[PDB]
Symmetry: C3
Subunit: 73 residues, 3 copies
């Protein structure tokens, strides 16, 4: 019973991780759009760059999670 | 019952994380909506690339929403 | 027993990493909502901010549950 449930938990997180990846892709596009709509504002530029860094870190963490899940056998 | 109890706690944790993702998906939907409304209310004044990327963002979000449904469906099968 | 215990620990670490990813997304959402404001729209952005604050609370709840695993 436990072993089956551990396998189900693993699959659940894999799916959750896919949802997070697709949301990261949504965030990339929203940031692109906001950048494109800028007035060519110094402060908005700063904040958008911080968002980009946060997004890149989000990607690294999801890779970490996926790699951890891969180690379950 | 150590392992059984921890499996219950893991299930609860993922359910909470999944809901966190759902609420963030709602944030994303409102954001894309605001931006698509702005862009569509003008001409494509920002440029056609903005409309395309906003359309792609909407598809991405629909995909993200379906992946949560799949995760929740899997958790639901845990006794 | 120990094999399942180890995989439980791995599942725990994986969810912790996923939660880190979500917190990072929440931080990007914060900055985008802020920037979108600076640039009925008010209503929709207030709902977005409301959803975001709730999202933060669900991660806190998740982390609390993970912390109880020992």
């Amino acid at each position: 019973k436990n072993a089956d449930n551990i396998n189900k938990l693993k699959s659940s997180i894999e799916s959750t991780n896919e949802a997070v990846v697709k949301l990261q892709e949504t965030a990339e596009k929203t940031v692109y759009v906001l950048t494109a709509l800028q007035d060519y504002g110094i402060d908005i530029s700063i904040e958008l760059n911080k968002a980009k860094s946060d997004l890149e870190e989000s990607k690294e963490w999801i890779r970490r999670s996926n790699q951890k899940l891969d180690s379950i056998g």
